[PDB]
Amino acid sequence: DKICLGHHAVSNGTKVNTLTERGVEVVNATETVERTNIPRICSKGKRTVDLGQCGLLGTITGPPQCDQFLEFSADLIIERREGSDVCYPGKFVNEEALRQILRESGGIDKETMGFTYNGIRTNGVTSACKRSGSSFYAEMKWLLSNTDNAAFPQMTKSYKNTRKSPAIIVWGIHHSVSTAEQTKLYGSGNKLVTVGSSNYQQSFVPSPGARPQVNGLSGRIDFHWLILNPNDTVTFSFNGAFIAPDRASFLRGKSMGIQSGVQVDANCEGDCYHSGGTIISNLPFQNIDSRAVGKCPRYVKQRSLLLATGMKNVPE
Amino acid sequence: DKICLGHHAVSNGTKVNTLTERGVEVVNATETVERTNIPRICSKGKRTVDLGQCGLLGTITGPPQCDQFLEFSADLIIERREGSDVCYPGKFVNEEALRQILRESGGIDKETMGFTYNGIRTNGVTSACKRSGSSFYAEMKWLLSNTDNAAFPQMTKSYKNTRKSPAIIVWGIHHSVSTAEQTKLYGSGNKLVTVGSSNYQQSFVPSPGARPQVNGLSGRIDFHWLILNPNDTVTFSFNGAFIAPDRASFLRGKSMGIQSGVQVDANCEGDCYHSGGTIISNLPFQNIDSRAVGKCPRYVKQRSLLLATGMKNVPE
Amino acid sequence: DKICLGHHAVSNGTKVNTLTERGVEVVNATETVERTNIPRICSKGKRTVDLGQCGLLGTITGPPQCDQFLEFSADLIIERREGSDVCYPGKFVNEEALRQILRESGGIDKETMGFTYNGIRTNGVTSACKRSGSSFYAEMKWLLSNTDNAAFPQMTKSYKNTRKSPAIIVWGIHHSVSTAEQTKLYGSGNKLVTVGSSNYQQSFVPSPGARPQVNGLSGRIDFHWLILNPNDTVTFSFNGAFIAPDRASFLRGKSMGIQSGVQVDANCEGDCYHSGGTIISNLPFQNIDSRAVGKCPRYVKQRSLLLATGMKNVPE
Amino acid sequence: GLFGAIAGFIENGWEGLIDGWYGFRHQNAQGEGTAADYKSTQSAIDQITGKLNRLIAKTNQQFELIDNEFNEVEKQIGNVINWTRDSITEVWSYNAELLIAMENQHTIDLADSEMDKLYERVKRQLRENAEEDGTGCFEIFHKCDDDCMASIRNNTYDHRKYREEAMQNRI
Amino acid sequence: GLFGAIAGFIENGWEGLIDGWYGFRHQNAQGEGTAADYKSTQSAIDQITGKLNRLIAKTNQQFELIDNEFNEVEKQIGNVINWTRDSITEVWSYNAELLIAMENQHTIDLADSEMDKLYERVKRQLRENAEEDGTGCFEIFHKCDDDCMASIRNNTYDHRKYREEAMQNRI
Amino acid sequence: GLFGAIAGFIENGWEGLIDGWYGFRHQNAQGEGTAADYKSTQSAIDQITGKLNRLIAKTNQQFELIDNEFNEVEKQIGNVINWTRDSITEVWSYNAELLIAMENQHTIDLADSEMDKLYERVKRQLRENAEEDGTGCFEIFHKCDDDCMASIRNNTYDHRKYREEAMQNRI
Ligand SMILES: *[C@@H]1O[C@H](CO)[C@@H](O)[C@H](O)[C@H]1NC(C)=O
Ligand SMILES: *[C@@H]1O[C@H](CO)[C@@H](O)[C@H](O)[C@H]1NC(C)=O
Ligand SMILES: *[C@@H]1O[C@H](CO)[C@@H](O)[C@H](O)[C@H]1NC(C)=O
Ligand SMILES: *[C@@H]1O[C@H](CO)[C@@H](O)[C@H](O)[C@H]1NC(C)=O
Ligand SMILES: *[C@@H]1O[C@H](CO)[C@@H](O)[C@H](O)[C@H]1NC(C)=O
Ligand SMILES: *[C@@H]1O[C@H](CO)[C@@H](O)[C@H](O)[C@H]1NC(C)=O
Secondary structure, three states: OOOEEEEEEOOEEEEEEOOOEEEEEEOOEEOEEEOOOEEEEEEEEEEEOOOOOEOOOOOHOOOHHHHHOOOOOOOOOOOOOEHHHHHHOOEEEHHHHHHHHHHHEEEEEEEEEEOOOOOOOEEEEEEEEEEEEEOOHHHOOEOOOOOOOOOOEEEEEEEEEEOOOOOEEEEEEOOOOOHHHHHHHHHOOOOOEEOOOOOEEEOOOOOOOOOOOOOOOOOOOEEEEEOOOOEEEEEEEEEEOOOEEEEEEEEEEOOEEEEOOOOEEEEOOOOOEEEEEEEOOOEEEEOOOOEEEEOOEOOOOOOOOOOOOOOOOOOO | EEEEEEEOOOOOOEEEEOOOOOEEEEEOOOEEEEOOOOOOOEEEOOOOEEOOOOOOOHHOOOOOHHHHHHEEOOEEEOOOOOOEEEOOOEEEEOOOHHHHHHOOOOEEEEEOOOOOOEEEEEHHHHHHEEOEEEEEEEEEEEEEEEEOOOOOOOOEEEEOOOOOOOOEEEEEEEEEOOHHHHHHHHHHHHHOOOEEEOOEEEEEEEOOOOOOOEEEEEOOEEEEEEEOOOEEEEEEOOOOOEEEOOOOEEEEEOOEEOOOOOOOOOOOOOEEEEEEEOOOOOOEEEEOOOOOOOOOOOOOOOOOEEEEEOOOOOOO | OOEEEEEOOOOOOEEEOOOOEEEEOOOOOEEEHHHHHHHHOOOOOOOOOEEEOOOOOOOHHHHHHHHHHOOOOOOOOOOOOOOEEEOOOOOOOHHHHHHHHHHOOOOOEEEEEOOOOOOOEEEEEEEEEEEOOOEEEEEEEEEOOOOOOOOOOOOEEEEEEOOOOEEEEEEEEEEOOOOHHHHHHHHOOOOOEEEEOOOOOEOOOOOOOOOOOOEEEEOEEEEEEEOOOOEEEEEEOOOOEEEEEEEEEEEEOEEEEEEEEEEEEOOOOOEEEEOEOOOOOOOOOOOOOOOEEOHHHHHHHOOOOOEEEOOOOOOO | OOOOOOOOEOOOOOOOOOOOOEEEEOOOOOEEEEEEEEEHHHHHHHHHHHHHHHHHHOOOOEOOOOOOOOOOOHHHHHHHHHHHHHHHHHHHHHHHHHHHHHHHHHHHHHHHHHHHHHHHHHHHHHOOOOOEEEEEEEEEOOOOOOOHHHHHOOOOOOOOHHHHHHHHOOO | OOOEEEEOOOOOOOOOOOOEEEEEEEEOOOOOEEEEOHHHHHHHHHHHHHHHHHHHOOOOEEEEEEEEOOOOOOHHHHHHHHHHHHHHHHHHHHHHHHHHHHHHHHHHHHHHHHHHHHHHHHHHHHHHEEEOOOOOEEOOOOOOHHHHOOOOOOHOOOOHHHHHHHHHHHO | OOOOHHHHHHOOOEEOOOOOOEEEHHHEEEEEEEEEEEEEEEHHHHHHHHHHHHOOOOOOEEEEEOOOOOOOOHHHHHHHHHHHHHHHHHHHHHHHHHHHHHHHHHHHHHHHHHHHHHHHHHHHHHHHHHHHEEOOEEEEEOOOOHHHHHHHHHHOOOOOHHHHHHHOOOO
């Protein structure tokens, strides 16, 4: 006449690992590393800006691709492989620093620097940057000599940040296909453009010479930039080979930027993004993408790590 | 007639966290994250140098702020927000590397490189760096042409590191307000100064042009520097726009540098510093300042983490 | 009549550490931090290339030290302190990036860029780089003016990466002892060499002036380089002070590079290398060299940490 | 696996138990039956749940790019970035493999603990009226009908009332 | 919380005990009393301090600035620095929260262990002269005056002296 | 050290046992002897081996130079590299000392467990035919020749066959 104690079990448990052996069968376990991606930019609730064909730095200078994006405003900014920062071939010096800035900017608000000038042409244009016919960077101006080979008045321009936030100033240098046609543009002689705020000093020389054709042309503008701080001044001492900023840029607030190739989806919420979609998971670890950004589980090397939620499974 | 066993308890225990529960009540616990700062630079026992209004890089070049700091010697170096590296407005190229060097140098010991000159002026001066009247960087020399608009002899000078420790050589470039007054100083033409040790080669051109007024003047010196090694020579090939090193600097030993805004206090010992004071603690973790330096507890996100030192508290 | 249970023990245990104790005696323990080095580069099974006196970057330009190394092929690449990247004194701009590339390249395969030229001499030579008599960098060519001070034709040259792997292009700039003797080489005037792919734009100026004698000379060539990508062109617009690439370099596959001063040994296998030999161990941690590379145990500060493998040792 | 009960002196468990984790199986006058002990079961599940809320949990720490999938950054800073990411990756792969190995050892043994806590608590009720069978049962040396079994299952059973019957029933 | 004693078959503890962690409460001829067991108490205290010297402890690893609060460094290296520091911060916040959860589970269970070791070591003294009442007491079925209690409290109590008496006092 | 057995209620161990970890020391008619319990010993060794294969183990993650022993890199990126390496070094030195401290506490205690697991299962074989002497032995109150102890160590011993003899020899 007796009583026995015992515990439950089942036909197949789940195998897990312990400090002392590999593959103990437990009643129930649960996964701890996320493997399932969902292939969309889960963007519900957030002010999103898919730049598409506009390059992020293009929002500062304004090639035709970026005309809808010169004063954007976002919680989340998506860059695309097809996007270009440029119309007239060229590049930004110190470029990724500018991107990491813009990505977290929550958008940009433009404002003129007011510049007018005397003794120059201000309206140079190109077949690369097409709007109606040949055009140019919306936010900048090709400054030239009045007539072929004319002297470029040695000029100085200054803008002061009237605001209580720091500005983004961007100028550029025109490297002409030849020293010959450097002259047809900006006149003759050694060409000096010099640029100092007061927390920054530096100066620039053009660099004419052959380059292979890109958008048809063999010339390059290389854009430069510095963050001007409140009640600071920036002075532009220059002689030619200059593309001049019409408007400065100010940053709106906070955001996060990502790079991706999958569709926006406003039915989905998510805070962990990678280029192939969104990691929706409450699990501590993930094996999807080690460069995921946002608020993510930790990337681990392991495909799987099972956590026991029941006792040892002993059957007969 | 019997015997009972039991354990102690208390009216209120301290609640802690475990692998299986949050807020279990235990008899006694003790905190593990330091939250208490004391708002002073606990400096007892150590050779301290509070630079105050002297910028750390000013110790190499020697503007009036730094006259008492040209040959300093320290275990601990304190930088201050009010400190300026400069008298005549300007910058150091490659600057933070120089500071991280000086901070850990245990001080600097100067020694002349002996330079004499023929065919130039050696004594240029300015109202920015005043001592008695207009003066200049104590450790450097404004090299000029003999008289207004005169030729600057194409000169080359060399210094050999006679010692068994590496030296810091620092020269500079004068960017003049205009090409006009570039000439009144150093004569006319393209100005090239060239600088190679043998483990380092490079060269420099001035860059005259307007910049906004700073200390009154709109010109800039931008200083440059190299680590010269034992029995090595550095050669200075130059034609103008040159500010020339009178003395080289050698480093004394070891130190730790911090930058702070609170008072030194020689009644207090401490090895963990941040800008708002000193963290005295034997605790493993701290929640005070994630950029603290020295010998510190590890910064953690959590304000508190209680460690049980007694059993579970069960009352009636 | 009775029965007792017990457990084993020994005269001397090994002392270990626990969560609650320091130096408890357990029956048996085993070490967990590797301390034993093997003072050789254990290289059995692997295609090894000991560069010896050839500098890794010398494999691109080809000074006499590197004649046996211009098209090498390796699983493992060993640099040596005695190795030189250069014969005619000089340096690479942006140098360590090139090294980290070559180290992991699995070797280099050269290929001509085919360039011929008209109106210049192509064959400048020096007593620093001797083979038979005075010679020059095998993979490059000193471009000069036909006869003393003759004009250097303003020239354009281009190479297209025909392959489906990215190329290494390397050119350099000759900084002459004086502007005087700049002229005897490449003629007179401001000297401009400009270089743009399409993914890279830039240009260069010589910088003549004195520097101290090294290999006999007071002159310097500074080499530059860019990764050209498939189906892309780089154009070389230049007027003088140019040393021109004869062959471009392509990377063979994968490898690992190390720096060391100990002997290769093909009798021992190993995947964890440091400059003083090879760490052969299955232990999780090592205290030998914190800059070890390859597939290594983790560097820890501690000399020893013993792991219990038996019970508590209790004797009488 | 510690504490000696599960996969121990209690040789294998019961697939027939679907009401909980730990149970009693009796055999008396009417015959066999079975019933699950809620409170011991709930102590295990509640403790496992504690762990599950510890780890199915939310970092709110945001990280951003310093890196670039479309226009690779210059290769020196790239290599330092990749070197740093991989070192940090090694750390978290170590921590993960170790955390769950550690909690799995604690989980398994935690359950075994709750049985030994149950066994030697009914043996404490049954005082001198029963004996250790060896393999997890008590031979109750006196008759305990289906009402006296619910007596033990809900911690009521008074041993004195069956004391005297049992004492020489054993002899 | 493992081992079954504290917050277990010893239903709640003693605020009246101020002399140690573990104690005896007797009741005999003269009446009640209490006294704290040093040697068991000292084993817990000594084990907790072992932990306390493991962690309130001082690394000598010096760290320096790579960063600047007054003249911010250029922003690319700044972002790599901030990215690295924050990854490192995540690690130590994880390690700290986990270490102290881990040491707390071990601490709590460590104390309960020392009780089960105390209970079942006096039962071994009293061998057949007593039985466990269920909730942490022994019914000593023979008389034990205040000198026979200090017998138990300091490992002297001889069983066979009260053996004869107790066996039939039991029946 | 938990579970109460090793360095506990079994006062010190046996240098004479070289056949295993846990053993029986008997004394009967013929006199003393000893023999080691394979099955308990193997459970410890097999569990320690599990740990040893978890930790004597092979990461396949290769790391390369971003650093240079012959021509030092620029001083800013050098300091960031050195700062990063040292922070990571601190982490692994913390993890290493903590892991093996953790595995040592578990190692010491699991072995002590396997003793309490053995003690407390031969007492269940011996039912009512013996008593806990206090110091890890059972007084068999009946005669057990050298085959009657090979019965226990091989988990065969029937207690009912010596029960009747033992019942009165105890009294
Ligand atoms: C900037 O200048 C104006 C001058 O009127 C002043 O009101 C303001 O406080 C200054 N400071 C800042 C931070 O803008
Ligand atoms: C420096 O120069 C002298 C030459 O007389 C020499 O003896 C010494 O070894 C050289 N090198 C060093 C490292 O001192
Ligand atoms: C490069 O050019 C050839 C020209 O026919 C073409 O076939 C090839 O697909 C191109 N693309 C690449 C990646 O080489
Ligand atoms: C860094 O890693 C990524 C993949 O994680 C790789 O695509 C990239 O090429 C690496 N950087 C360098 C310089 O190789
Ligand atoms: C890096 O973090 C500090 C605070 O820890 C912040 O002040 C600084 O602005 C950050 N750097 C950048 C580029 O935002
Ligand atoms: C970085 O560390 C190495 C050794 O780990 C040392 O030799 C080197 O000098 C350090 N960097 C600097 C700038 O001192």
